[PDB]
Design an enzyme around this catalytic site. Structure first.
Site, PDB file in Angstrom:
ATOM      1  N   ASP A  16     -30.273  20.047   7.772  1.00  0.00           N
ATOM      2  CA  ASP A  16     -30.249  21.011   8.894  1.00  0.00           C
ATOM      3  C   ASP A  16     -31.262  22.145   8.689  1.00  0.00           C
ATOM      4  O   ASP A  16     -31.006  23.322   9.020  1.00  0.00           O
ATOM      5  CB  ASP A  16     -28.838  21.566   9.078  1.00  0.00           C
ATOM      6  CG  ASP A  16     -28.663  22.285  10.427  1.00  0.00           C
ATOM      7  OD1 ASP A  16     -29.345  21.868  11.390  1.00  0.00           O
ATOM      8  OD2 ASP A  16     -27.886  23.273  10.512  1.00  0.00           O
ATOM      9  N   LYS A  31     -31.848  17.845  11.576  1.00  0.00           N
ATOM     10  CA  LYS A  31     -32.399  18.692  12.618  1.00  0.00           C
ATOM     11  C   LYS A  31     -33.942  18.607  12.692  1.00  0.00           C
ATOM     12  O   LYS A  31     -34.621  18.620  11.655  1.00  0.00           O
ATOM     13  CB  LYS A  31     -32.001  20.177  12.381  1.00  0.00           C
ATOM     14  CG  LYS A  31     -32.234  21.069  13.599  1.00  0.00           C
ATOM     15  CD  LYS A  31     -32.981  22.379  13.225  1.00  0.00           C
ATOM     16  CE  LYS A  31     -32.165  23.286  12.266  1.00  0.00           C
ATOM     17  NZ  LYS A  31     -30.921  23.850  12.889  1.00  0.00           N
ATOM     18  N   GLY A  36     -21.457  24.903   6.811  1.00  0.00           N
ATOM     19  CA  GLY A  36     -20.636  24.417   7.913  1.00  0.00           C
ATOM     20  C   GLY A  36     -20.556  22.903   8.105  1.00  0.00           C
ATOM     21  O   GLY A  36     -19.490  22.357   8.404  1.00  0.00           O
ATOM     22  N   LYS A  69     -21.505  21.628  15.504  1.00  0.00           N
ATOM     23  CA  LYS A  69     -22.552  20.638  15.865  1.00  0.00           C
ATOM     24  C   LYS A  69     -22.247  19.284  15.219  1.00  0.00           C
ATOM     25  O   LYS A  69     -22.441  18.219  15.837  1.00  0.00           O
ATOM     26  CB  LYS A  69     -23.960  21.088  15.432  1.00  0.00           C
ATOM     27  CG  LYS A  69     -24.460  22.397  16.092  1.00  0.00           C
ATOM     28  CD  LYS A  69     -25.831  22.832  15.511  1.00  0.00           C
ATOM     29  CE  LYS A  69     -26.231  24.232  16.011  1.00  0.00           C
ATOM     30  NZ  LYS A  69     -27.681  24.571  15.645  1.00  0.00           N
ATOM     31  N   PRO A  97     -24.940  28.216   4.906  1.00  0.00           N
ATOM     32  CA  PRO A  97     -23.755  28.443   4.071  1.00  0.00           C
ATOM     33  C   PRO A  97     -22.820  27.245   3.919  1.00  0.00           C
ATOM     34  O   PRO A  97     -21.927  27.324   3.065  1.00  0.00           O
ATOM     35  CB  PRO A  97     -23.026  29.587   4.811  1.00  0.00           C
ATOM     36  CG  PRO A  97     -23.395  29.388   6.227  1.00  0.00           C
ATOM     37  CD  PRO A  97     -24.858  28.955   6.172  1.00  0.00           C
ATOM     38  N   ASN A 127     -43.751  29.983  18.989  1.00  0.00           N
ATOM     39  CA  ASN A 127     -44.303  28.790  19.615  1.00  0.00           C
ATOM     40  C   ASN A 127     -44.853  27.795  18.569  1.00  0.00           C
ATOM     41  O   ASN A 127     -44.971  26.614  18.854  1.00  0.00           O
ATOM     42  CB  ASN A 127     -45.374  29.161  20.673  1.00  0.00           C
ATOM     43  CG  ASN A 127     -44.773  29.780  21.944  1.00  0.00           C
ATOM     44  OD1 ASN A 127     -43.574  30.094  22.007  1.00  0.00           O
ATOM     45  ND2 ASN A 127     -45.628  29.996  22.958  1.00  0.00           N
TER      46      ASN A 127
END
Ligand SMILES: CN1CN([C@@H]2O[C@H](COP(=O)(O)OP(=O)(O)OP(=O)(O)O)[C@@H](O)[C@H]2O)c2nc(N)[nH]c(=O)c21
Ligand SMILES: C[S@@+](CC[C@H](N)C(=O)[O-])C[C@H]1O[C@@H](n2cnc3c(N)ncnc32)[C@H](O)[C@@H]1O
Ligand code: NA
Length: 402
Positions: free
Chosen positions: A219, A259, A142, A99, A140, A229
């Site tokens: 993130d 994010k 990334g 990403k 972790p 929901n």
């Protein structure tokens, strides 16, 4: 819902930015009445201030279709339905890493090759200058693995993430200082505790000549199984603290990517409004490496302004209040007045258009997964070729871990 006449998938992606903010950064006095406390609202279906009712109700109903389905059966269909699925993580430790590979390309290497406002690169590798970055809510690791791999050397990172099963796994990096909020390896790494925020802030400043990082990546998420929901509402404090961390440790002129999930509530949009006042330019973007049926997107903030301290201290105070109100019948439900936000017609227009377009696509992606559950012969024929094209475009070699 008809997902079947959607455009062909492509490695080419389009970015749309909020227009540049044309107002002053809010000061303490301006914000003195902005924090509104009311009853805790565990209701999402009426949150239509920045999205039409029919789209909101449709996306909720398309998610709820899955309440009766076994998780693995849904995921198996998801795997087949996602045109971009086969990218995975390539040689990185997880798919999350890709990403950042994706978005660092899309945003003109603004993260790995940050520039001043006039376009001149800030870090000179030939002179052994260091790119300083931070990564929070990050285990972790990334996103950081990507940054370190792209740079190869001369990149110094600082991280903070919860201890436990999802802690950093530095050993798994293909090619960095985790901090937990107390010095060295000590602390719980919880970004929502004020003392951890302050401690990480001082740690990063003390290691960047008191200037802060070139950029921050964030993130944050956690499991919402059985209450999917409500994700946006459940993750409200985490969203706030990541935004707070950006105003706390990013140097002037520096960048922030974080994010989010749904941005339907006034709380969420008011936070995004604050970023938009604090940075030269802000965008909401869902990369094709973010799976199409979920509520995930990223807010990308370019060029932090001078004079953001009052907004920083304001969010620090709101977080303290959120902590005070945990397990009570009350909560902080607004951080900027709705009449202020909607008084900015350019901001509000972008906001609504972003929410509605994401909803439209997500509805189709959810209906498509449901169709693929019922008919296991359906397929996305070009997954391998799309994968090949994305790696090439993004400058990611097609190699495996040994
Ligand atoms: C199994 N799911 C999934 N889901 C929601 O539907 C969207 C897509 O499902 P998903 O593929 O499991 O989401 P994603 O976050 O990509 O998965 P991860 O946890 O691997 C997400 O927004 C998710 O939160 C659901 N929503 C409701 N209301 N009920 C459900 O049983 C489920
Ligand atoms: C989706 S993952 C991050 C993945 C990361 N970007 C990567 O590439 O590996 C979310 C992370 O945020 C962490 N997190 C959740 N709540 C947190 C909190 N209150 N404080 C610090 N970290 C948190 C989770 O434990 C998890 O490691
Ligand atoms: Na995803």
């Amino acid at each position: 819902v008809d997902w079947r006449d959607e455009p062909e998938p492509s490695a080419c992606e389009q970015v749309s930015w909020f227009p540049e903010c044309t107002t002053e950064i809010p000061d303490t006095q301006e914000m003195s009445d902005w924090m509104v406390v009311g009853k805790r609202k565990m209701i999402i279906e009426d949150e239509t201030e920045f999205c039409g009712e029919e789209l909101l109700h449709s996306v909720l109903q398309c998610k709820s279709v899955f309440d009766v389905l076994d998780g693995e059966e849904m995921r198996r269909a998801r795997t087949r339905a996602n045109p971009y699925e086969m990218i995975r993580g390539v040689f990185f430790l997880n798919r999350a890493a890709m990403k950042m590979a994706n978005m660092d390309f899309v945003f003109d290497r603004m993260f790995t090759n940050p520039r001043d406002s006039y376009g001149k690169p800030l870090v000179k590798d030939r002179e052994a200058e260091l790119l300083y970055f931070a990564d929070v809510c990050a285990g972790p690791g990334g996103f950081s693995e990507y940054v370190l791999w792209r740079k190869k050397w001369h990149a110094k990172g600082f991280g903070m993430t919860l201890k436990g099963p999802n802690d950093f796994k530095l050993e798994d990096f293909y090619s960095f200082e985790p901090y937990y909020g107390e010095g060295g390896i000590d602390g719980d790494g919880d970004i929502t505790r004020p003392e951890n925020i302050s401690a990480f802030r001082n740690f990063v400043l003390d290691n960047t000549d008191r200037k802060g990082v070139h950029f921050l990546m964030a993130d944050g998420g956690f499991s919402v199984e059985g209450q999917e929901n409500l994700q946006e509402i459940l993750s409200k404090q985490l969203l706030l603290c990541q935004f707070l961390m950006a105003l706390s440790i990013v140097r002037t002129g520096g960048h922030f990517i974080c994010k989010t999930f749904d941005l339907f509530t006034p709380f969420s949009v008011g936070l995004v409004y604050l970023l938009y006042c604090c940075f030269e330019r802000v965008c909401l973007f869902k990369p094709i490496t973010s799976r199409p049926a979920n509520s995930e997107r990223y807010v990308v903030c370019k060029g932090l302004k001078v004079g953001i301290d009052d907004v920083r201290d304001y969010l620090f105070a709101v977080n303290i209040k959120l902590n005070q109100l945990r397990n009570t019948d009350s909560d902080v439900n607004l951080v900027v007045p709705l009449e202020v936000i909607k008084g900015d017609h350019e901001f509000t227009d972008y906001m609504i258009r972003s929410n509605e377009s994401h909803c439209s696509l997500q509805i189709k992606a959810l209906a498509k997964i449901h169709a693929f559950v019922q008919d296991t012969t359906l397929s996305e024929p070009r997954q391998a070729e799309i994968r090949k094209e994305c790696l090439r475009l993004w400058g990611i070699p097609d190699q495996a871990r040994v």
